[PDB]
Amino acid sequence: RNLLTNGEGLYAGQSLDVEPYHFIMQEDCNLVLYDHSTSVWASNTGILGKKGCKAVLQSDGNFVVYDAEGRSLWASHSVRGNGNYVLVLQEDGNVVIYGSDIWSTGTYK
Amino acid sequence: RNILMNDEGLYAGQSLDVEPYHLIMQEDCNLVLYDHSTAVWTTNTDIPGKKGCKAVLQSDGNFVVYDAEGRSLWASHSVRGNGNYVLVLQEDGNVVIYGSDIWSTNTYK
Ligand SMILES: OC[C@H]1O[C@@H](O)[C@@H](O)[C@@H](O)[C@@H]1O
Ligand SMILES: OC[C@H]1O[C@@H](O)[C@@H](O)[C@@H](O)[C@@H]1O
Ligand SMILES: OC[C@H]1O[C@H](O)[C@@H](O)[C@@H](O)[C@@H]1O
Ligand SMILES: OC[C@H]1O[C@H](O)[C@@H](O)[C@@H](O)[C@@H]1O
Ligand SMILES: OC[C@H]1O[C@H](O)[C@@H](O)[C@@H](O)[C@@H]1O
Ligand SMILES: OC[C@H]1O[C@H](O)[C@@H](O)[C@@H](O)[C@@H]1O
Numbered sequence: 001r002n003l004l005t006n007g008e009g010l011y012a013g014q015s016l017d018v019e020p021y022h023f024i025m026q027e028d029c030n031l032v033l034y035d036h037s038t039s040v041w042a043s044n045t046g047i048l049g050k051k052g053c054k055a056v057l058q059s060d061g062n063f064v065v066y067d068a069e070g071r072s073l074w075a076s077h078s079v080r081g082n083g084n085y086v087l088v089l090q091e092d093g094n095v096v097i098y099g100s101d102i103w104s105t106g107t108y109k
Numbered sequence: 110r111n112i113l114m115n116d117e118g119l120y121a122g123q124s125l126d127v128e129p130y131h132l133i134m135q136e137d138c139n140l141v142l143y144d145h146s147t148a149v150w151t152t153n154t155d156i157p158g159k160k161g162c163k164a165v166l167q168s169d170g171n172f173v174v175y176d177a178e179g180r181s182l183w184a185s186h187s188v189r190g191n192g193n194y195v196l197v198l199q200e201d202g203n204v205v206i207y208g209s210d211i212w213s214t215n216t217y218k
């Protein structure tokens with residue numbers, strides 16, 4: 001997987017992968033982007049033993065990490081209002097959240 | 110491949126594939142979306158005498174099918190100005206263009 005749409009997220013251990021790039025929600029609750037085994041970016045929210053966290057792209061365009069409970073720990077704070085958004089791990093090493101839908105075929109089944 | 114970014118395109122014979130869906134820029138210049146083997150969406154540009162067309166997501170948000178000579182055979186008319194856009198073939202069978210980045214890790218290489 002390389003992207004997340006409204007309501008989708010990464011549970012502890014889950015990740016997006018493209019080439020040697022890896023964006024993962026770890027069992028220490030740290031959200032990290034790796035090039036091979038080298039860490040490149042992180043939410044700096046890790047704590048050994050803090051398992052069960054979840055990262056989720058929401059309807060408001062906000063990407064949030066929650067704990068085993070449902071308490072927030074980190075967020076891009078990119079709330080822009082209800083709509084359709086997507087988070088993508090790009091081939092250029094960048095992780096991006098995109099505006100809202102501007103066009104579609106409308107062929108959802 | 111399941112997405113196109115600014116200025117990327119599908120050339121004759123190329124496609125985006127999120128089984129069972131297939132968005133293919135056919136040799137006959139017709140851009141078609143198939144569910145398994147059934148066509149469900151089309152640009153309706155299989156004009157006689159046309160060959161070597163390409164479908165490209167433009168920096169202005171517009172998605173347009175061009176003929177060998179660079180003529181506009183079809184467009185989504187989704188022009189929204191200059192920015193960053195991404196067209197994606199979703200697992201729900203829908204083809205969507207998400208308009209302009211609202212957040213990023215800023216980790217491009
Ligand atoms: O910042 C993220 C980006 O940084 C670059 O220097 C490389 O390490 C890439 O592999 C990575 O995607
Ligand atoms: O309309 C869908 C259908 O159109 C026809 O003209 C051809 O281009 C076929 O390849 C395509 O499946
Ligand atoms: O800075 C990145 C680094 O932060 C912490 O040390 C842990 O979450 C590691 O798993 C991670 O690689
Ligand atoms: O700070 C995190 C917080 O930001 C906003 O208030 C909303 O998007 C909430 O859903 C989210 O929990
Ligand atoms: O019209 C855009 C919107 O259509 C449907 O609701 C779904 O396919 C969404 O994923 C998509 O963002
Ligand atoms: O009508 C299609 C036409 O729309 C706009 O003018 C631009 O996006 C052009 O590049 C494109 O060819």
Ligand SMILES: OC[C@H]1O[C@H](O)[C@@H](O)[C@@H](O)[C@@H]1O
Pocket residue numbers: 090092094096114193210213217
């Ligand atoms: O800042 C967002 C922007 O960053 C860079 O320019 C590229 O990775 C683009 O694809 C992305 O949309």
